[PDB]
Amino acid sequence: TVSEAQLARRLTKVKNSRRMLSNKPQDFQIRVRVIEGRQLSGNNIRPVVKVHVCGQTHRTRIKRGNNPFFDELFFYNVNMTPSELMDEIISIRVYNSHSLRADCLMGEFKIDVGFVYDEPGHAVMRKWLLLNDPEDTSSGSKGYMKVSMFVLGTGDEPPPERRDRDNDSDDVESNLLLPAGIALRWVTFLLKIYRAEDIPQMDDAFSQTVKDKKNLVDPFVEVSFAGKKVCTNIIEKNANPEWNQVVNLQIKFPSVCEKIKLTIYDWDRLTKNDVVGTTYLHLSKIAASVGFVPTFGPCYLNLYGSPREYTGFPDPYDELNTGKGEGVAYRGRILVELATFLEKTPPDKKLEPISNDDLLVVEKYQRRRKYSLSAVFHSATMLQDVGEAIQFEVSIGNYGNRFDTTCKPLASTTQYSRAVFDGNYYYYLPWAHTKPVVTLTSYWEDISHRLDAVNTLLAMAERLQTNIEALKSGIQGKIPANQLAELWLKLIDEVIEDTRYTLPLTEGKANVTVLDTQIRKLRSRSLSQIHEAAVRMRSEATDVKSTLAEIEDWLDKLMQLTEEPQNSMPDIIIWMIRGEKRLAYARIPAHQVLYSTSGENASGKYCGKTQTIFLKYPQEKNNGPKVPVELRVNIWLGLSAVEKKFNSFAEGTFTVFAEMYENQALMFGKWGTSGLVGRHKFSDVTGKIKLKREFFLPPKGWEWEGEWIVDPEGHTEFTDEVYQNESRYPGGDWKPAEDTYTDANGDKAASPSELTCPPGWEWEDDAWSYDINRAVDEKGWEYGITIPPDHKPKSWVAAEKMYHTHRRRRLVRKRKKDQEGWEYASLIGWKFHWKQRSSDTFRRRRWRRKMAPSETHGAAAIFKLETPIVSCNFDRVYIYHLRCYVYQARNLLALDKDSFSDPYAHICFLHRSKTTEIIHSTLNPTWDQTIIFDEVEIYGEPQTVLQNPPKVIMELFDNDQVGKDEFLGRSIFSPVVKLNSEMDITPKLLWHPVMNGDKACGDVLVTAELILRGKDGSNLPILPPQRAPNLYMVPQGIRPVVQLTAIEILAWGLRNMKNFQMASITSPSLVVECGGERVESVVIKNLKKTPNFPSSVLFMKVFLPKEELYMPPLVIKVIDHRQFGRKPVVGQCTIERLDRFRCDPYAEEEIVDWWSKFYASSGEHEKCGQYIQKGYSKLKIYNCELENVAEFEGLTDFSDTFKLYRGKSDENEDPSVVGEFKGSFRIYPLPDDPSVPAPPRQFRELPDSVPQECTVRIYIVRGLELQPQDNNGLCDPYIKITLGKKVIEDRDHYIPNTLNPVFGRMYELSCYLPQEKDLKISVYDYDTFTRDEKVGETIIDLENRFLSRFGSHCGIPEEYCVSGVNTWRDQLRPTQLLQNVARFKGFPQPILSEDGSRIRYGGRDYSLDEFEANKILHQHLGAPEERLALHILRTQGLVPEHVETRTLHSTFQPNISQGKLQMWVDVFPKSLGPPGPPFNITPRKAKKYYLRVIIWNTKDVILDEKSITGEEMSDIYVKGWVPGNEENKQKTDVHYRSLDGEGNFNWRFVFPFDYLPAEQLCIVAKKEHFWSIDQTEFRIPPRLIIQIWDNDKFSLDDYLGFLELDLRHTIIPAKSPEKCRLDMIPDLKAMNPLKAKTASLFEQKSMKGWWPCYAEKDGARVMAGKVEMTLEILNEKEADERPAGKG
Ligand SMILES: CCCCCC(=O)OC[C@H](COP(=O)(O)OC[C@H](N)C(=O)O)OC(=O)CCCCC
Ligand SMILES: CCCCCC(=O)OC[C@H](COP(=O)(O)OC[C@H](N)C(=O)O)OC(=O)CCCCC
Ligand SMILES: [Ca+2]
Ligand SMILES: [Ca+2]
Ligand SMILES: [Ca+2]
Ligand SMILES: [Ca+2]
Ligand SMILES: [Ca+2]
Ligand SMILES: [Ca+2]
């Protein structure tokens, strides 16, 4: 089917155009411009064009004739998401207009913005449209419309144009926007919506608790597609609704929408409709190109969003329910199906019931299979908070939810564990050898045929990506070619052995959809293509450095194949619950842990493997300053039928304890079993339920271990912590509490003067101190309030208030190197602690028995227990030894007010933490420190550690002397694991990003290694050398190998230095620090007087790493030497990309003006003119800036520009720019032998650094497509130029009513470079009664023009002319410029011959005849030696004579072009002399013409319109006018009472019109109303419209027919009225017409003959008559030679 192929190709174009687009809403600008209408329907119409994009509307003025010309440009400014703006439509509707009535619709065209995003150049150019009625399209077309539309986002620019103006006008049938084969075809999607389930409670339960807790929701689905929203029925009071309703989505092929948005809403009668959840169906992801149409389902789509717990208060995370944010809890799921029906249009029912046979079909997609989940919680580290206990809930879907009411108790949560200080900074849950185990059972559809293929292709691409990074490491480490070829052959053999995999069959399985079969066919085709390309490349390719592009193509193809839109299995969400409140979440995709019987590859990556997940706060997109917890968890999901296969995945021995409590009390100082306050002797934990010993029995698959007995349950450095607490009444005075010293238990503890060291320990510091590195006041106290029954606080603030009742202070100190089982409390059922205090009068003891699984069931008996609680016991501990080589950091955030930081780092690994040193006043620290954790206890087998190592976390902090230490970022990386000695290789330092928030805020050069510690640590390597006590250096193998290099700094000068401490930078100096070395420039005496350093060359010999990867950043500082010896830092920059700085140190009436040259160099106007044939000069028009031309290197080849910064940053971003340092660097290694001489310096050709007075001539040519600044869509632009303090405002010489203003004006200035180097060219809008609006601005570094090698101070023309128009405008002759660029390059002085026939340059002799080969020379050329010097001056990349096109920028839209400005700048330094004659770029005037017609005869004119005289009769007379010259409407005399349609007139006409011969376009100026401020300038092609009128004695004048003749392309007439046939005019509407014989009236100055006249009746041409006339065009000279006559 042809149409399904077109839909598939369009959707795959949308797919591969939307695969890099982000989701952050940014700014977009849409330019839609109409040009010209052709063959518009109707009779004597007055057409306008109205464009409606996204609510903003624009409209062109009233034009005339059926072939109108508008040339109107319209703008639209929106800020949408770059995956959402492709839902909008552009509507072009054409309206006939009447003088006294409303408009009438004639044409209508819709188009998606996606296709005009999709086009090359991000825009379509000069394309034609099909105008038709929006639903009466069977009546035929009603005209054509030439438009152009543009899409530009951040950094995008519109494309330029060529000479295609005569290619697009008559040849419409090749320049359509859409061809005829696509047509106006409807596309229908039948989105059947069957049912939903597990919808959360979204209504109040107060109504139902007075008159069920599960069904308090009234859901319906709102389906948003292409702007339209269709709402299904409301199912009142049903958490499992059943709609069974098709939604007939509709589009057309010109407007293809991609994103379907399903949104379940709770219907509320009074309040707003709450949002349950949102899913998306991506049509580009469920369709492909044989290919297939969009298909989906019947498959459940899981919703995610806010937590399911209902609160009547407004929901704080309700933005997650709208689809923004990733969603933290399961919100239910909805069963949908999607089909595509093509070329059939459904009826007006948007919503129909699902047919019953589809309801019996869908039952096989709802089959439930039992699933078993097990989670072994290994470690919960990096906790920031110790107050109250922490548990973890595992839930998949709604199964395992702790807060949901349920019939039986569930084992979905771990026990409440209190955190334990690790001795340095963090906390960890003390799980040790007894890990918590969570087991829950669920029921989902067995969609294993999808997830098997997904997991196997994911394992394929993971192996391929591992081999890809292996080859990348091989080519970056410069490995020998044999090992690289071996790694490449291993990659290719692994790809060959992988992609012979056969996908799971679609037969015999109930849940196979149509999309499953099409996806399997696409996957088989892609895998066979990858396999065959792999065998072909193994058999044919040798260059392994060229095939990796196809290998990355294989990688992103495999990434495309792993996308499963039908993943109905919901994510497993792990929730940390501190107290009774949900705190942090982590979503694991359930396919990643799903077990498959098809093998290890079909199982998930983390199926039965310990994985490290970082929990997140419920609306943070990523981890911020505080990670809540780091979890290592061993999750196994699988079918409950194959749950006996969990025995292979299980490590350790599972264990459940049955418990029994025995209680006593105290009378008269003796304990006894009586006296209990409402509690039993043998009872439960609460004591209220009496339970026997025989009540606990082992279930099936379990057995007893042991017997019923009484069971009451490597740090070299450490830091203790005690807390001091005070209590008071509100408004009272503070006094110490009864628990004056507390701990993590929450009760009284030992005094700081009471606790001592353990044996084998010692004290580092003998005095206690209070911690100031917390959220406290100046004295180290936090404050809080208490509400009963919580008499002790759980949250604290950093400030004191009068209502606070408690306060707390942390104290720290550094450290180095009974059996009866009775637990006592002051009450029964209270908190029993280990030993009896003075107030305890009650006691109890625990008494238990261990249970173990039977050997016949294995470790899978934990799934048969469904309160029995499971814990996994490891019988062996494995000791490890981690070494983190923290070398350095770069580009850290500035978080102090002295524009630096004091960065240190918390190295964390499992339950261990240490801290690096604090490096003061730097953003690029070099810690050079090895952080050693000996004796790290990790449980599980060492192979599981080797496969999935625990992460090392690098939390960087700016140290502050007062207050909190601010957060710099976080680097997470894995250590290389060494389980033995045989694979002992040197670990390699890598730059890991310091992720702060959403972006990287630097990199750290860090690696780590985790060695399995043997017996007495004998296999461990030797300790690194110590540069300080307990301070290890990075050892010699890991540290970068340094060589003596040299850094040359061209300290040229400082620009734009802003004020520091309200005083200007008067006496600055430069400090360049790199590699621990520094150099300092001399102090500038006055920056206002001299802005450049007097000594511009600095030099330092720094030991720098040999590897280009390990190169440290280069730090630039500016120090303002002020009074009293104060030397603050007023600017700093960091330059890490030093690869660019590496260098090898040993390496008729042809009136000629400037505008004729500009047109001939444009290529659009006068391309075939005689100007090029006679061989005059040209110029090079750039479509961008001169700094954006890659040939001239951005004009910073002498010295770059590095922006300096100051102060604290903008919390994620760069700080405020306080200046610029202009300079460059040359880094090159030095010989280590002092006897070998140094390499020569790279800076010897330096110019004079004093300020230079210069005359800058700013030629401004024209503007292109500005932003409108008036309400009528127009502008009145003028030029405002600022240059330091000088300002030229050309407000008196503004150009009225132009979006394309031909300025043509010079603005000559004088300035002192480089104090006034910033040349600002701003275009401003004239307004008479209001303020002026800035259209945009451009910034030109005039010093970059002045100091460049490329000669950008003045472009060099094609030929050296002395007199005339193209005179030499530079100060230096081409010989002087040639010898200057010879002296720049190191070439010798050029040799000038006496006759000028030859010169020498660059070691090559040049000759005049090598460039003057058969070229016609004229009288404007000058000296031959200067001509030859210029003829060789254009060959070495110098800047030619040019018109650059600089894009205007504004704060309206930051990186979006506000317009274009064609112009150029000539900087002339006054030390070289005065410049030459200036160019006259004044715009040329219009040549006046008179178009004279003489109306000879008429023949076969149609009969009269019905008048009062009531006869079959005819009156004929002829009108004629030019569009734009309707004030020149004249007419002939009347031939009354024609009996056969003939009429003699001989009435002469004279048409005054002004013309542009070079632009081939008529020019007219006329105000658009009488009260207009200024005269509108109108640019239209020259066309003559002659129409036949009718006159009556009493009734009005009537219209019969028309003809239209473009004066450049006039229709050659017939020589007789009987030979005056129709269709000489191209019909161009119903069939492909014959080409009209066309000739220009401007050259062929006169012609005579008969022309056809026609009018359209019901879309078909009808002969309205014939006319004989003679057309002649004469200019002013011919009007002077012979008179024009009457008219
Ligand atoms: C006696 C019952 C009167 C009930 C009167 C009534 O109409 O109350 C409506 C409000 C809001 O209820 P919603 O369903 O909009 O909750 C929307 C949801 N919070 C969300 O944002 O997701 O109910 C409550 O505040 C809870 C009951 C308060 C009862 C005082
Ligand atoms: C109510 C009287 C004060 C009104 C002051 C005021 O704000 O006027 C703005 C308007 C439109 O001004 P512009 O055409 O420059 O458009 C500006 C562009 N749309 C923008 O981006 O702002 O002025 C008039 O209508 C002209 C008569 C003014 C008569 C003072
Ligand atoms: Ca509600
Ligand atoms: Ca409701
Ligand atoms: Ca509501
Ligand atoms: Ca700080
Ligand atoms: Ca600091
Ligand atoms: Ca204005």
Ligand SMILES: [Ca+2]
């Ligand atoms: Ca204006």
Ligand SMILES: [Ca+2]
């Ligand atoms: Ca204004």
Ligand SMILES: [Ca+2]
């Ligand atoms: Ca009439």
Ligand SMILES: [Ca+2]
């Ligand atoms: Ca008449």
